[PDB]
Design an enzyme around this catalytic site. Structure first.
Site, PDB file in Angstrom:
ATOM      1  N   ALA A 218      -8.465   8.323  65.942  1.00  0.00           N
ATOM      2  CA  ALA A 218      -8.197   6.966  66.390  1.00  0.00           C
ATOM      3  C   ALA A 218      -8.390   6.924  67.891  1.00  0.00           C
ATOM      4  CB  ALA A 218      -6.768   6.570  66.028  1.00  0.00           C
TER       5      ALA A 218
ATOM      6  N   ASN B 246      -7.142   0.327  65.141  1.00  0.00           N
ATOM      7  CA  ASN B 246      -6.315   1.476  64.855  1.00  0.00           C
ATOM      8  C   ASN B 246      -5.169   1.042  63.924  1.00  0.00           C
ATOM      9  OD1 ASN B 246      -4.943   3.920  64.701  1.00  0.00           O
ATOM     10  ND2 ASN B 246      -4.248   3.838  66.825  1.00  0.00           N
TER      11      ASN B 246
ATOM     12  N   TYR C  62      -0.412  19.788  66.847  1.00  0.00           N
ATOM     13  CA  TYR C  62      -1.648  19.060  66.958  1.00  0.00           C
ATOM     14  C   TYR C  62      -1.740  18.530  68.378  1.00  0.00           C
ATOM     15  CZ  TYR C  62      -5.294  15.633  66.221  1.00  0.00           C
ATOM     16  OH  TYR C  62      -6.453  14.875  66.353  1.00  0.00           O
TER      17      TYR C  62
ATOM     18  N   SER D  95     -10.498  11.170  67.235  1.00  0.00           N
ATOM     19  CA  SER D  95     -10.260  12.582  67.023  1.00  0.00           C
ATOM     20  C   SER D  95     -11.158  13.175  65.951  1.00  0.00           C
ATOM     21  CB  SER D  95      -8.834  12.884  66.670  1.00  0.00           C
ATOM     22  OG  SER D  95      -8.011  12.820  67.814  1.00  0.00           O
TER      23      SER D  95
ATOM     24  N   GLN E  51      -1.402  15.015  74.369  1.00  0.00           N
ATOM     25  CA  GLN E  51      -2.377  14.346  75.190  1.00  0.00           C
ATOM     26  C   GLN E  51      -2.353  14.911  76.544  1.00  0.00           C
ATOM     27  OE1 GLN E  51      -3.107   9.921  73.511  1.00  0.00           O
ATOM     28  NE2 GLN E  51      -1.040  10.599  73.926  1.00  0.00           N
TER      29      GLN E  51
ATOM     30  N   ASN F 140      -4.654  17.200  71.679  1.00  0.00           N
ATOM     31  CA  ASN F 140      -5.916  17.021  72.383  1.00  0.00           C
ATOM     32  C   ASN F 140      -6.118  18.087  73.411  1.00  0.00           C
ATOM     33  OD1 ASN F 140      -6.458  14.560  70.927  1.00  0.00           O
ATOM     34  ND2 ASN F 140      -6.107  13.254  72.771  1.00  0.00           N
TER      35      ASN F 140
END
Ligand SMILES: *C(=O)[C@@H](NC(=O)/C(=N\OC)c1csc(N)n1)[C@@H]1N=C(C(=O)O)C(=C)CS1
Length: 358
Positions: free
Chosen positions: A315, A340, A147, A61, A117, A149
């Site tokens: 990560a 990670n 937050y 990210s 996601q 993606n």
């Protein structure tokens, strides 16, 4: 390297690697504008290939910082505005919940609960349209930060549409090449395969897989040297000769929303320096970093404040990265690892190192 650098780095990172069982790691510390490099361990365990200055890591990210800056560049070019509705660049998104969702919202995770996601089952551009057309917000636009993606990812893909360039070609031509990031790739070419570290998830060697909006959200790979250069470029955008890139960098650090003691930029996140360490360390824990939080609009956004801690975590299945820097004190750090491991561990170490040098 001034002793104090060595001092801190070895004291802080070594136990960290052992505590987290990290097979390979690379650290760069930018101190009064100059980089100082440290590597540990293996890029490939089975091959016993050491981490070096040329090893590529999956940024995960942290890629979002490139995406914010590319977007900033596109604004500066006059190609998009952050006040544009999302539908201006994707007219097929016709479902009523999209009305009033602007590029600002996508870029800053405030569209109203776009998901963390993009689901793995989304493959084709067809699936992608269906996914966003079916999504139902949990909140109204511009009220909560969650937050995601799928938020900043969409921003990246749409931001490049007026250029007509793919996302990869825009990033390469408008950001990587001008900053002379020559070991930085969205798709690692054959000649670099030998430098591309493996990630490790529970002992298995892994590389990120193709995913929808991967390049936009999490798909950059880079070396410790190129990542130092990224930091310097973002510490001091004035040294940058490309007018629109200079401006794009500055816009990525504008403060658009405030939640608690943090401010959302384009990709970058920021806090006032001096900063309470507990706040960034604790804030990096996913139980806070991934939680929905109310946002106050900063109308109009505050220009990049030099007295800032400016940072981003990232990560993938097998990698963990962190970048932070403080433009006032010309200080920064990059931490790339091929496991990670928990965000707060990275942020803690980073603060120990940079606090010791400030
Ligand atoms: C950014 O780092 C992004 N992370 C990811 O999308 C992935 N993993 O995160 C653990 C990822 C991409 S491809 C793959 N196999 N895994 C966001 N950041 C976090 C985070 O850990 O900070 C996430 C929880 C997922 S979304």
């Amino acid at each position: 390297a001034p002793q104090q650098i060595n001092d801190i780095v070895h004291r802080t990172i070594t136990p960290l690697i052992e505590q987290q069982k990290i097979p390979g790691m690379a650290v760069a510390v930018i101190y009064q504008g100059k980089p100082y490099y440290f590597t540990w361990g293996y890029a490939d365990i089975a091959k016993k290939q050491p981490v070096t200055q040329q090893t590529l890591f999956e940024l995960g990210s942290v890629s979002k910082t490139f995406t914010g800056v590319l977007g900033g560049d596109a604004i500066a070019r006059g190609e998009i505005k952050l006040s544009d509705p999302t539908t201006k660049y994707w007219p097929e998104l016709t479902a009523k919940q999209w009305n009033g969702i602007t590029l600002l919202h996508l870029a800053t995770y405030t569209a109203g609960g776009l998901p963390l996601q993009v689901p793995d089952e989304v493959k084709s551009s067809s699936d992608l349209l269906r996914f966003y057309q079916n999504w139902q917000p949990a909140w109204a636009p511009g009220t909560q930060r969650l937050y995601a993606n799928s938020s900043i990812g969409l921003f990246g893909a749409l931001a490049v549409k007026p250029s007509g360039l793919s996302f990869e070609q825009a990033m390469q031509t408008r950001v990587f090449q001008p900053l002379k990031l020559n070991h930085t790739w969205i798709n690692v070419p054959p000649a670099e395969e030998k430098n591309y570290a493996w990630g490790y998830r529970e002992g298995k060697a892994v590389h990120v897989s193709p995913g929808a909006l991967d390049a936009e959200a999490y798909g950059v790979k880079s070396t410790i040297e190129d990542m130092a250069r990224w930091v310097q470029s973002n510490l001091k955008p004035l040294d940058i000769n490309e007018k629109t890139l200079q401006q794009g960098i500055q816009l990525a650090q504008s403060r658009y929303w405030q939640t608690g003691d943090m401010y959302q930029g384009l990709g970058w996140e920021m806090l006032d320096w001096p900063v309470n360490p507990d706040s960034i360390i604790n804030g990096s824990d996913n139980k806070i970093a991934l939680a929905a939080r109310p946002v106050k609009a900063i109308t109009p956004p505050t220009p990049a404040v030099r007295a800032s801690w400016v940072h981003k975590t990232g990560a993938t299945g097998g990698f963990g990265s962190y970048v932070a820097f403080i433009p006032e004190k010309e200080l920064g750090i990059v931490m790339l690892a091929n496991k990670n491991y928990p965000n707060p561990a990275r942020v803690d170490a980073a603060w120990q190192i940079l606090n010791a040098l400030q």
